[PDB]
Design a protein around this ligand. Structure first.
Ligand SMILES: [Cu+2]
Ligand SMILES: [Cu+2]
Lengths: 620, 620
């Protein structure tokens, strides 16, 4: 049916069959990534050709391959062998995570380190984390994971409360070798537990909370069609799901009268980096590229009706591939519902005697994922007035360390002896713009203050200025909250009734961007995170701000390489990459479990409509 | 029994009785402002002396007075006569607004202007606006209003769609004389109607919106006692209502185990200025001090159940005084309710096998007011985790003008020939801090980036710095979104278990502040609006950032004057004044009626608690 439909179990199995038939998926092969490709640029194009891209790992150590297959035609479109030391390692496999603790349990250097701290190896959990790229020449071309230890006293114990500082081990997950065990010194292992489910900690539970019942007597106002096609209050879109990116929104459009007007072709969080700012050798290499290295969609939670998603919910259970190419369903991994959103518009007019009040509501599409200690919710919102918004919700358990005796400039104390290294959670939203079609441009709009004098004798005048970003070389922009800087994406060939190019304005939160020194490994690997806004000329192979292979990959790919092409973006098929994140100095209130913190951005119509698009909203 | 209870109708009548009896409420006397006084600083107030402050205007031009009466004793504590040319005029009375149109209607110059435009005087509505202080020496000591004309074709017609540009009149509302009629030239009066209730404009109403019902089977979780005392999820506070400020929150405190710990002594929006940035002489004087000149509580709307406030609502119907001292109730002028706020905390732990999810909730206390064309919702939120938030929602009908032939650098076009002068809506939240009591201090916290090198060889380290504001002369701060600047209010004498002063962190939205030239009258009169954060030593007579008598004051009153005292604020009874607002370049989408736009700020506990305060929240 629709070329934007979710991948089905059958398609996944068929991709497996095709790879096998091609001799690309024997018993030592593992699917490190599998996702359906979006239809090529066409108004429908030459019939349906569902293509899937696959990253194939080889557990024997042979070179991996990147393969595109047409599940429709039963063919391999292309299959290229990868030189990982050059272009990057494939995403980490789940099975490789499990390897780390096991191998370390029998390494004598590790056992010696644990013995030095009087810790029973059977109780030492190991957080197997991405390695990144540092000064270890022996790691080039190899698949490494760095392990950090946490003591788990009993089964239901939260090990995060017990970091074993001063110790870190590097592990080759293919050759199954412990390459290095670093011990900088013994640190007391924080003893207080952080068992938020333990009555000893929680105390008696509140009996003061009365029920809040959110019901929809006649069912929701949106319709789901073709499995993932949503239609709600003039909006139209397809809810896609990729194992790397998670929920992806396709063909976001608004029915203005009789015409379905496109706004955003594709919206996704293309990368998510969580850099740590503790200069201790034990953690100074810690940088989670949750999307790029771990693949957030792979870890999407099954949402429970009641507490995860309240109200009348319609779920999607996306299917992904397991490491062997078999389809695996994430039951209720996506929540879809509409929620009341207060007042939309209100005016009590003295002169006419008319009092008008209308309520707002928003369509919500979300999913939650778990990356070890942290859990992140991705929420996309569509409002009646045409506003589009994304909201990331960060919760879970903060990553701990020991709190240094003489305090720390890069770690905060959460409990006695317990520290929490400073870090950030930075996202990159990739917005493949289609403001009334593909001919778009971006203007940076700043408020302009004026000097009191001729023509402004009372010094009350203030203006605004817009600068068209014409070439990619001049499209890497930074925020300026002080001048109320925003970016407008317009279609220079599509004017509203007032003869102005229709547009949408992007409102950023203006949070700090990547803090790391510009010469650091992380600044180069997460170069996108150093600037608030990037605009590129669309290209089918420019998908992530960090490139296709982030795992242990240096700089050289991603946005910085794309921008160098210096392509024309003035009234062309363009892509907006917005960097936005949280800078965290963990508080005691964040321990034992972090209350949700949020960050996001939104786009509001800017002369897109000919007047307010909510005049037809009923009293209700 | 509570000295924070809302004024009763009877108490208003009592003030009236007292005033007339003392011969202070004669036939020519008018009450321009009346409000109960907050209890003074007194640890154990046993003798309750309920006092009211009243601003008495004299329609005969005789000097007005500031009078303080004790409703308890039935006496006049004070009665001071005011030299308005020195200390500003009193707030405008509704009757004075009314007289403007009437007066102009018989003025030759006005009728001449209307005749030239072929406008029927009976159809011309006049927006009677505050005058400010400009170059008209003859206005000093006089009560002036400036009127702008709008054509109302019929009774249920929206006059805002038809501004009459090139025309403005100045009226002395006491002598009832038209002091000036300025006609800079004819401008076509915009012809299209903006009648958002007209099916011709709305088209057929949506039938797609299914109902979303929010109910509470067992009623609300908050208790209202003593008429306005709220207890909800460990929070404790008193909801007051003043005619100038509107909803005012008193004694915000959180029950941490045994102790009821104070956080904010008093929270209010102490001023809200809407300055216009159109240099045209027709509007270059336009600056609404909604709170100070118009009194926002006076115009509070009677909210409708199911319309303005959905769910299980508990209303307060505050009473205010009219111009003659008679009590007038604003039925259902305040909404109180708790609403679901999604996920509070969530973590699915692999190691313990424990999947934990908790819902968030916020207590909402709000009111809506109408200032002519615009309508503003003021919302205060209290969250389960101890977060306090304020949100202002701006709606209504934008103030119009003609859109100049050839465009404009200071006005945007909404409809054919219809203009919308650029302007801002800037608020001042006055937060009389009481973090664990009154001994407080404020620190400005900036993110600190570090250079790669010794101690930071991987260039990943990032820190933060805090600067204590010790004196008022260094307590006028600006935003720095770039460095993630925030301001922490702590009690240096109250420490948490980790031996650090308890605190709360104010997170500003970092919107632009007042854009007007620094030498402008509006910069001088609304100086508070030029900076994001101010900290002053508490003083009972320092209530408004703009001073007590804002109307036609020359400038420098309020904040800049208080700050000039240069008092000690390092560990003293202090008050935080946060400036925040929306910079508006009206869009076509804001016409004919503006969809809600928002601004706010919030404060989060910062080492205030010893661990998460929401560990006892039940699973539901
Ligand atoms: Cu964090
Ligand atoms: Cu506005």
């Amino acid at each position: 049916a629709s070329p934007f439909r979710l991948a089905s179990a059958g398609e996944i199995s068929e991709v497996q069959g095709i790879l096998r038939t091609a001799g690309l998926l024997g018993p030592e092969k593992r699917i490190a990534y599998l996702g359906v490709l979006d239809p090529a640029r066409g108004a429908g194009s030459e019939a349906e050709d569902r293509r899937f891209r696959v990253f194939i790992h080889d557990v024997s150590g042979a070179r991996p391959q990147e393969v595109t297959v047409s599940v429709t035609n039963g063919t391999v479109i292309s299959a290229v062998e990868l030189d990982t030391a050059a272009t990057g390692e494939l995403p980490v496999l789940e099975e490789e995570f499990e390897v780390v603790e096991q191998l370390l349990a029998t390494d004598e250097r590790w056992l010696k380190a644990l013995a030095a701290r009087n810790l029973d190896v059977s109780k030492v959990r190991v957080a197997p984390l991405s390695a990144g790229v540092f000064e270890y020449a022996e790691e080039r071309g190899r698949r490494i994971l760095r392990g950090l230890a946490f003591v788990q006293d009993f089964p239901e114990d939260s090990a995060w409360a017990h970091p074993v500082d001063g110790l870190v081990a590097y592990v080759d997950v293919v050759s199954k070798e412990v390459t290095r065990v670093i011990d900088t010194g013994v640190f007391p292992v924080p003893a207080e537990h952080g068992n938020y489910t333990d009555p000893e900690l929680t105390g008696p539970l509140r009996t003061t909370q009365k029920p809040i019942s959110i019901t929809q007597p006649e069912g929701p106002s949106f319709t789901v069609t073709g499995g993932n096609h949503i239609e709600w209050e003039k909006w139209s879109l397809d809810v896609g799901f990729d194992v790397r990116e998670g929920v992806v929104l396709h063909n976001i459009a608004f029915r203005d009268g009789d015409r379905l007007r496109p706004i955003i072709n594709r919206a996704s969080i293309a990368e998510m980096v969580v850099p740590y700012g503790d200069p201790s050798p034990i953690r100074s290499w810690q940088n989670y590229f949750d999307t790029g290295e771990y693949l957030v969609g792979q870890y999407a939670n099954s949402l429970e009706l009641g507490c995860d998603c309240l109200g009348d919910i319609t779920y999607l259970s996306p299917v992904i591939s397991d490491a062997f190419g078999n389809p695996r369903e994430i039951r209720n991994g996506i929540c879809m519902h509409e929620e009341d959103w207060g007042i939309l518009a209100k005016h009590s007019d003295l002169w006419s005697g008319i009092n008008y009040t209308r309520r707002n509501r928003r369509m919500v599409i979300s999913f939650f994922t778990t990356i070890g200690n942290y859990d992140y919710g991705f929420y996309w919102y569509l409002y009646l007035d045409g506003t589009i918004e994304f909201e990331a919700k960060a919760t879970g358990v903060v990553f701990t360390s020991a709190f240094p005796e003489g305090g720390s400039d890069n770690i905060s104390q959460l409990a006695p002896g317990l520290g929490a290294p400073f870090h950030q959670h930075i996202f990159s939203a990739r917005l493949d713009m289609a403001i009334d079609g593909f001919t778009n441009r971006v203007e940076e709009e700043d408020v302009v203050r004026q000097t009191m004098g001729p023509g402004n004798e009372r010094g009350n005048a203030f203006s605004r200025k817009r600068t068209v970003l014409t070439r990619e070389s001049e499209a890497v922009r930074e925020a300026d909250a002080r001048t109320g800087r925003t970016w407008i994406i317009s279609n220079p060939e599509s004017k509203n009734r007032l003869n102005e190019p229709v547009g949408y304005k992007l409102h950023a939160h203006n949070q700090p961007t990547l803090l790391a020194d510009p010469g650091s490994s992380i600044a180069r690997r997460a170069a996108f995170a150093t600037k608030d806004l990037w605009v590129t000329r669309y290209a089918d192979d420019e998908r992530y701000p960090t490139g296709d292979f982030v795992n242990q990959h240096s700089g050289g790919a991603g946005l910085p390489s794309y921008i160098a092409q210096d392509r024309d973006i003035d009234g062309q098929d363009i892509v907006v990459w917005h960097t936005f994140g949280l800078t965290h100095f963990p508080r005691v209130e964040d321990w034992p479990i972090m209350p949700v913190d949020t960050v996001g951005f939104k786009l509001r119509p800017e002369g897109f409509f000919d007047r307010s698009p909510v005049l037809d909203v009923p009293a209700n």
